[PDB]
Amino acid sequence: DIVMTQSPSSLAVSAGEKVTLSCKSSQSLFNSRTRKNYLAWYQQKPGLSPTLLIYWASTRKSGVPDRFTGSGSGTDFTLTITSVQAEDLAVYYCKQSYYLRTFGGGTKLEIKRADAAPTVSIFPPSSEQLTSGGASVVCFLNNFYPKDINVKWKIDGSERQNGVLNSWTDQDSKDSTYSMSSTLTLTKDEYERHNSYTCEATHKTSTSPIVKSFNRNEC
Amino acid sequence: EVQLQQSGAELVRPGASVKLSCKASGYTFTDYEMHWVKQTPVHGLEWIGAIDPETGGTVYNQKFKGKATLTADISSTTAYMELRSLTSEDSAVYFCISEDIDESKDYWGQGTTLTVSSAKTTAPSVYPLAPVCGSGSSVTLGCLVKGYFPEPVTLTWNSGSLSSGVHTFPAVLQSDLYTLSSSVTVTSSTWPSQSITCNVAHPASSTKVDKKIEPR
């Protein structure tokens, strides 16, 4: 039961930089009959199956970009990305195939970029939802950086904490920003008791929050 | 073209068992070993075991011996994995993987999301989110996928032909029901003069719904 350990468990770099990922095995992966180190590297993007990058520790799979280079022998192996691209964000796993299979714990590769303010959009309940008897108010806080951000709902001018669910995207593979949805869920009865609905986004790019609001009876 | 077909989702009760299937095509079935891998947020990828379809021989991760049993049917080129005495610990995404004799190539299924729960399958409601009543350079539309169980849903726009400017937010769970949303940003010259539809698949209910975004 060969054990695999990866490090770091996460790291962030700006695009263009190099990264070195490490993977150590509990015993040698070198086969003294085929002269192979049975060590592989996989890239897993969110919502997709992992893809094979490197096998026999240094043989790059055909069609894999040149910037990926595996190295090592025995117990210590390295994945080098000689110039990180925005699309390279992923969790990278090593996997030994010497006696059985074992995956490392993975390295999550994140990208640093300049700060950017969120663009805020607010959405009243759809008429479809209301006819079905429910009412969700949705606010998107899109394409901001860094990932930390705060949302405040106000109903008729007063803070509302109950009924809010927040959800952050994975970092964007194209521009390296984050986005977040904030959904206030009410019954239709409760929605119709109030008039103004406001979502306030506070981000480190400005002291003033970014506010979007609407009034129910102006639909 | 080598393909491994797994079901999108299975929902089964705690204490029961389930037989996941993996239908292989595009290669000589007995040539390649078939492996199974578990994915969770807590443990990442865990190898479960592998079967040699030629011999029926199997081998297992110590952790899963007596949890999992791997079999294969050669004539239907299908590999199976039976999991027994299910707990919430077994809720996970399960992949099958065919290992080419050419070690430069392996082939992954799309993964089956197994949910161990007593809750009922619930198809989502899918709601179009058009902008607030009342102009700018560009416009943001949304799609709200509310109240489904179990995971997953997949969401596209215009059948995937609209993919730039898209943000799809991971689902959150509340009272045994998930909710997910997605936003898409386009120029005001494209919408509403061109049609924009969000497409939602919920494999556990065999649901495939289209919602065209229409102005309020």
Author numbering:
A (entry chain A): 1 to 219
B (entry chain B): 1 to 134, 137 to 218
Paper text:
Fab 7881 binds to intracellular loop 3 (ICL3); the flexibility of ICL3 prevents the crystallization of the receptor.
Here, we report the first high-resolution crystal structure of the ghrelin receptor bound to an antagonist. The ghrelin receptor structure, as a class A GPCR, shares a canonical seven-transmembrane helical architecture and an intracellular amphipathic helix 8. In addition, several reports indicated that the ghrelin receptor exhibits strong ligand-independent activity. Moreover, both a Fab fragment antibody (Fab 7881) specific for the ghrelin receptor and an antagonist, Compound 21, were added to bRIL-conjugated truncated ghrelin receptor to increase thermostability.
